[PDB]
Amino acid sequence: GIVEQCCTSICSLYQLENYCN
Amino acid sequence: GIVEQCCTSICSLYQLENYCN
Amino acid sequence: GIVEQCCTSICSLYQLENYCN
Amino acid sequence: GIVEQCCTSICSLYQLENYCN
Amino acid sequence: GIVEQCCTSICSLYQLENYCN
Amino acid sequence: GIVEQCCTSICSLYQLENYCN
Amino acid sequence: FVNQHLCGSHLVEALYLVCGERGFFYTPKA
Amino acid sequence: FVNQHLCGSHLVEALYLVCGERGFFYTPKA
Amino acid sequence: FVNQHLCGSHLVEALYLVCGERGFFYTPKA
Amino acid sequence: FVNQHLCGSHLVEALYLVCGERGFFYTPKA
Amino acid sequence: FVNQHLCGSHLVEALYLVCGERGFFYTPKA
Amino acid sequence: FVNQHLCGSHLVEALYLVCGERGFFYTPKA
Ligand SMILES: [Zn+2]
Ligand SMILES: [Zn+2]
Numbered sequence: 001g002i003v004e005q006c007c008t009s010i011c012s013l014y015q016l017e018n019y020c021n
Numbered sequence: 022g023i024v025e026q027c028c029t030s031i032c033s034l035y036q037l038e039n040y041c042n
Numbered sequence: 043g044i045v046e047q048c049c050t051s052i053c054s055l056y057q058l059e060n061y062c063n
Numbered sequence: 064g065i066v067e068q069c070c071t072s073i074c075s076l077y078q079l080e081n082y083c084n
Numbered sequence: 085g086i087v088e089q090c091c092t093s094i095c096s097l098y099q100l101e102n103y104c105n
Numbered sequence: 106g107i108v109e110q111c112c113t114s115i116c117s118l119y120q121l122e123n124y125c126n
Numbered sequence: 127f128v129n130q131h132l133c134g135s136h137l138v139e140a141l142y143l144v145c146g147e148r149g150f151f152y153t154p155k156a
Numbered sequence: 157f158v159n160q161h162l163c164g165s166h167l168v169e170a171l172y173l174v175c176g177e178r179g180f181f182y183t184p185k186a
Numbered sequence: 187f188v189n190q191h192l193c194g195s196h197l198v199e200a201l202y203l204v205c206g207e208r209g210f211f212y213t214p215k216a
Numbered sequence: 217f218v219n220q221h222l223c224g225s226h227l228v229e230a231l232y233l234v235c236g237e238r239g240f241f242y243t244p245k246a
Numbered sequence: 247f248v249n250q251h252l253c254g255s256h257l258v259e260a261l262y263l264v265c266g267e268r269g270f271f272y273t274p275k276a
Numbered sequence: 277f278v279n280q281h282l283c284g285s286h287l288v289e290a291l292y293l294v295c296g297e298r299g300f301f302y303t304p305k306a
Contacts, residue, residue: 070222075217082240
């Protein structure tokens with residue numbers, strides 16, 4: 001998931017917006 | 022909400038577990 | 043300054059990028 | 064100690080209570 | 085205490101070293 | 106730099122003062 | 127365990143510590 | 157904005173700064 | 187993205203997240 | 217509650233949330 | 247070095263940074 | 277004071293506690 005991708009690889013703030021309510 | 026119970030008022034670590042999936 | 047715009051007042055993540063080199 | 068166990072292995076909040084005053 | 089000197093009032097990094105073992 | 110030295114090796118608070126304005 | 131005032135990012139760090147692997151939901155609108 | 161390597165509680169901090177009051181869901185893998 | 191009140195160390199953590207590898211400057215005197 | 221992998225300053229945060237006002241002692245190994 | 251207001255978890259993170267390997271004690275009741 | 281191993285956002289926290297209001301510049305390598 002996003003939690004794993006951010007830590008094993010990298011993620012952007014735009015990807016993280018997919019998880020806002 | 023969680024904010025009215027933990028921020029405005031005070032809450033225990035047990036009350037925080039109600040917001041865990 | 044950054045403090046008057048983000049702390050005293052509110053600011054967006056975009057406004058924070060003006061302080062990046 | 065508790066400081067080393069939590070970081071090399073894992074620890075629980077109940078174990079951490081052994082260090083409260 | 086440390087709270088009355090550092091939180092209520094202000095303290096220097098040197099004053100914080102008095103609470104180190 | 107200081108950012109890399111602190112993380113690959115170690116740094117002191119006195120070295121970090123070289124970066125205050 | 128004790129009771130405290132938990133606000134802002136301090137509140138979600140608490141949620142992370144308590145829930146851990148279970149995950150959690152932060153809904154201030156609730 | 158730039159790409160970031162976020163692990164542990166540092167990821168929930170980033171979620172809190174991006175979502176703010178909108179709230180968010182933290183769901184790590186099983 | 188949303189707007190928020192960011193004060194103290196919370197403000198510089200936000201600067202770190204937004205700027206990242208670009209670096210940043212924190213000048214409250216400005 | 218769940219088991220947690222706490223290192224560095226993340227451990228002192230957890231101690232502060234568990235002990236609160238009771239206070240606590242942080243004593244890492246020699 | 248400078249003087250500041252350090253409260254809550256921000257205060258113990260400061261104690262962790264200053265004391266480090268020496269360890270420290272947080273006793274608000276004192 | 278003691279020597280510290282600071283990485284990521286933990287380094288900007290330390291800078292904020294040492295420099296305070298004087299402000300500081302965070303400039304990681306290219
Ligand atoms: Zn960390
Ligand atoms: Zn705070």
